[PDB]
Amino acid sequence: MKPPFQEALGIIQQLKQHGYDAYFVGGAVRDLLLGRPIGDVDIATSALPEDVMAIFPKTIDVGSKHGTVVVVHKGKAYEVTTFKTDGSVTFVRSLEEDLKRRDFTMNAIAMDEYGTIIDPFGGREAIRRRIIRTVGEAEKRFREDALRMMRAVRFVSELGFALAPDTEQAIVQNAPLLAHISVERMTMEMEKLLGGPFAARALPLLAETGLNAYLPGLAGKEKQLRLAAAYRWPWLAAREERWALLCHALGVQESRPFLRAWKLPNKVVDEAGAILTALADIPRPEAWTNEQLFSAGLERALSVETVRAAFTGAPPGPWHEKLRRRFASLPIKTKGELAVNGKDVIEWVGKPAGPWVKEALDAIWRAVVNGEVENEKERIYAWLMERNRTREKNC
């Protein structure tokens, strides 16, 4: 018994004692078998949501309308699912009926409270061979939930399996069915695919399969995707950095309309382009400017070089480290640090409050930062004063 399932063993036990019968199901079994780090432990039972909400103290009702209940056990969250037949939903007592409904074979395994692998679908084979195959006709299943395709391809990104000949085919043939699946749902899938350790050949595949030109803004970029192979994807740390390079390697013009089609939250689509930009503007890592760094702010700066990295081949290590230095020597690091107040500039140049004031301070920080004038009140005063009679001699 692996500690993953060890603590999770209770869930089963209590479900068995109340005469219910339960199994470990899903990837957790796969990962265990495959020999991956074990993800979410998932548990499937013949006990109805209501029976599970009676047995366990903490019970979160996520969607008792389609089988699942989240059971807080011993300080974790496990997803217990009453066996079902994907028709509304129909609940059975046949575990075999349940496995029978899942996307692919690697997923359709189950292990008993004792540790005996229950594989009525050749999951065990699939894994040794490392192949994503459909549970039943690949055709019928994609008709049963089109999204099942995207993920067949994400799995390729996430595990590094190959697709099954008849399964892959089925995708190109049934490609259209995607436009029927909500964008929201497509995005989360794209966003895991992207973080694959095999992303590199997931994306291309996304193309060789019919799947391209049904996903947001991925019309006819076939060439771009296949090429995407050389990108060091897996050193991208973050979602932004992800979307970031994804754009770049598509060559995507305006990041904003694109990432928005993907129904991504603003804060990403904003910081997305943020970096996409700083990247175009700075073509070289040595070229970062005390101004520019201050402007983008450490975190983003680094993320820039890490995207750059994923494009170049050049390890970001040293740059990250040079930026981290520079940024902690920038005589200020935010605008709020500026020893001098917007009101100070008014009482100083004897003008009414207005538009000029911004431009003033605008050019004061760019002075403090580039080390031109200190960040003390007195000196910035003279600095301002003495640069205003300069703007009289010049015109």
Ligand X SMILES: Nc1ccn([C@@H]2O[C@H](COP(=O)(O)OP(=O)(O)OP(=O)(O)O)[C@@H](O)[C@H]2O)c(=O)n1
Q: Say whether 145 counts as a known binding-site residue.
A: yes
Q: Does the annotation place 98 within a ligand binding site?
A: no
Residue 133 counted as an annotated binding residue: no
Spatial CA neighbour of 103 closest among 164, 179, 182, 34: 164
Out of 7, 21, 51, 86, the residue judged to bind a second copy by CB under 8 A: 51
Q: Whose Cβ is closer to Mg ion: residue 145's or residue 208's? A: 145
* Contacts to ligand X from residues 55-114, by CB under 6 A: 102-103, 107
Shortest CB 22 distance to a second copy, Å = 18
Size of the site for ligand X (CB under 6 A): 11
Site membership for ligand X, residue 39 (CB under 6 A): yes
Should residue 70 be labelled a site residue for a second copy when binding is judged by CB under 8 A? yes
CB-nearest residue to Mg ion: 40
Query: Per CB under 6 A, does 21 bind ligand X?
Result: no
Has 30 been labeled as part of a binding site?
yes
The sign of the dihedral angle between the CA atoms of 342, 346, 351, 352 is positive
Stretch that binds a second copy, among 48-56, 107-115, 133-141, 216-224 (CB under 8 A): 48-56
The count of residues interacting with Mg ion (CB under 5 A) is 2
Question: Does 27 contact ligand X by CB under 6 A?
Answer: yes
Site string for ligand X, 110-149 (x = CB under 6 A): -----------------------------------x-xx-
Which distant-in-sequence residues (6+ apart) come within 8 Å of 333 by Cβ? 294, 297, 298, 327
Residue 267 near a second copy by CB under 8 A: yes
- Are residues 154 and 196 in contact, defined by beta-carbon separation less than 8 angstroms? yes
The token pair that represents 23 in the structure block: 């199994």
Which of 1, 13, 36, 50: binder of a second copy (CB under 8 A)? 50
Report whether 178 contacts 213 (CB < 8 A). Answer: no
Selected binder of Mg ion within 1, 2, 36, 40 (CB under 5 A): 40
Nearest distance, CB of residue 105 and Mg ion, angstroms: 16
- State in angstroms the smallest separation of the CB of 15 from ligand X: 18
Residues that constitute the known binding site for CTP: 27, 30, 102, 145, 148, 151, 154
Name the residues that contact ligand X, by CB under 6 A. 25-27, 39-40, 102-103, 107, 145, 147-148
Name the residues that contact a second copy, by CB under 8 A. 50-51, 54, 58, 60-62, 70, 72, 75-77, 265, 267
Residues that constitute the known binding site: 27, 30, 40, 42, 102, 145, 148, 151, 154
